[PDB]
A = this chain, B = another copy of it.
Amino acid sequence: REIITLQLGQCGNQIGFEFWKQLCAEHGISPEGIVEEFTDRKDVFFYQYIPRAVLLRVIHSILNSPYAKLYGNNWASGFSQGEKIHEDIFDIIDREADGSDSLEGFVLCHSIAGTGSGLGSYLLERLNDRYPKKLVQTYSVFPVQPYNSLLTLKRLTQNADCVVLDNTALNRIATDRLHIQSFSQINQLVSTIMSASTTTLRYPGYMNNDLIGLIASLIPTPRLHFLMTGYTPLTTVLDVMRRLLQPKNVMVSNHCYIAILNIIQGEVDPTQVHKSLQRIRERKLANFIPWGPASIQVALSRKSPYLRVSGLMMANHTSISSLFERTCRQYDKLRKREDNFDEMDTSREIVQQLIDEYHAATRPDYIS
């Protein structure tokens, strides 16, 4: 199986370029795409080595960097221009998909705030229509700005089969424990999460060896497909498992979890893992849905020898609905302040359905 990544807009290319820089170093691959001398599965992302990337002004900064050997602001303008080059950009993907052994997914790195907002919404509709069996995971990044923010939200709630990273929680963590006061400094933090998000697809493990294994575990219902991240070390597994549940680390600005996935990338002791989960159940640090039986999953991994204990948390929290109301509320305030303008309210209508879908998920009778 393979995964082809797509990078749209200025935000996509940079956080994508920093994603490949971190991964090329994790493996024994020199910046000129030559293996250095100095067991890790590298066929999923690299093609025998060349990354399976599709980049879409900022391109010149990449071509002048030492990594050259490795390859408007209205949402309507972004959607329109994609319609004009439909066959052009779909000719580099078709060969990228066909030439692949057995395609599995389409990782998308973009921010919903201008062209990547529109051109991103356009490709998301074409992708599902062209292939219905291909997963589309999108590493969206949250910030006329309120309009374009919810328009893509309409497309992300029916097209994308699965991770939010909001800049507000990025700015707060930056000033708190990193002392930045800068785009080039926050990108070092997001790329650390991305390279850690797929740490179970670059190393042959016991379970979660496929992209559909990470997705179907968390997402119970195709509407509730928004996840958040947690990454503590910026020692036993109990210390890491407790620090991840602190809201000071969750990258999100009643309420309960639906399913949690913990990633431990260290050399920790494999028998004490059940002991930590036991004390979590006693102290009751996390609450879950009352309707369906939900559990917490923890998986170990092995760090690359060429490139200490870390930990990442992937969870499906109902509190993510709060972020949508902020985008939703700001829209109505702009709708009273200023061909048919009917595409917006349809988007406004469908996003409200998800919000009510979330608030009804935390009830003991969410079914029907």
Residues of the B chain whose Cβ atoms lie less than 8 Å from the Cβ of A48? 243
Q: Quick check: A98 and B247 within 8 Å, CB to CB?
A: yes
Which residues from 69 to 90 on chain A have a C-beta closer than 8 Å to any C-beta of chain B? 69
Which residues from 228 to 270 on chain A have a C-beta closer than 8 Å to any C-beta of chain B? 243, 246-248
Q: Quick check: A99 and B247 within 8 Å, CB to CB?
A: yes
Interface of chain A, main secondary structure: loop
CA A69 to CA B178, docked complex, whole Å: 10
Residues of the B chain whose Cβ atoms lie less than 8 Å from the Cβ of A243? 48
Residues of the B chain whose Cβ atoms lie less than 8 Å from the Cβ of A69? 179
Residues of the B chain whose Cβ atoms lie less than 8 Å from the Cβ of A248? 95, 99
Contact with B along A27-42 (1 / 0, CB 8 A): 0000000000000000
Shortest distance from the beta carbon of A249 to any chain B beta carbon, whole Å: 10
CA A48 to CA B98, docked complex, whole Å: 50
- Closest residue of B by beta carbon distance from A177: B50
- Closest residue of B by beta carbon distance from A48: B243
Which residues from 91 to 105 on chain A have a C-beta closer than 8 Å to any C-beta of chain B? 95, 98-99
CA A98 to CA B246, docked complex, whole Å: 10
CA A95 to CA B95, docked complex, whole Å: 51
CA A40 to CA B59, docked complex, whole Å: 51
CA A248 to CA B99, docked complex, whole Å: 7
CA A95 to CA B169, docked complex, whole Å: 14
CA A317 to CA B179, docked complex, whole Å: 48
Residues of the B chain whose Cβ atoms lie less than 8 Å from the Cβ of A99? 246-248
- Closest residue of B by beta carbon distance from A232: B48
CA A251 to CA B224, docked complex, whole Å: 47
CA A246 to CA B48, docked complex, whole Å: 11
Residues of the B chain whose Cβ atoms lie less than 8 Å from the Cβ of A95? 247-248
Which residues from 118 to 170 on chain A have a C-beta closer than 8 Å to any C-beta of chain B? none
Shortest distance from the beta carbon of A51 to any chain B beta carbon, whole Å: 13
CA A95 to CA B246, docked complex, whole Å: 11
CA A98 to CA B255, docked complex, whole Å: 15
Shortest distance from the beta carbon of A4 to any chain B beta carbon, whole Å: 14
Residues of the B chain whose Cβ atoms lie less than 8 Å from the Cβ of A247? 95, 98-99
Shortest distance from the beta carbon of A248 to any chain B beta carbon, whole Å: 5
Shortest distance from the beta carbon of A129 to any chain B beta carbon, whole Å: 23
Which residues from 21 to 73 on chain A have a C-beta closer than 8 Å to any C-beta of chain B? 48, 69
CA A248 to CA B52, docked complex, whole Å: 13
CA A246 to CA B99, docked complex, whole Å: 6
Selected A-B contacts with CB under 8 Å, 8 pairs: A48-B243, A69-B179, A95-B247, A95-B248, A98-B247, A99-B246, A99-B247, A99-B248
Give me the 8 closest cross-chain CB pairs, A-B, nearest first. A99-B248, A99-B247, A99-B246, A98-B247, A48-B243, A95-B247, A69-B179, A95-B248
5 A-B pairs besides A48-B243, A98-B247, A99-B248 with CB distance below 8 A are A69-B179, A95-B247, A95-B248, A99-B246, A99-B247
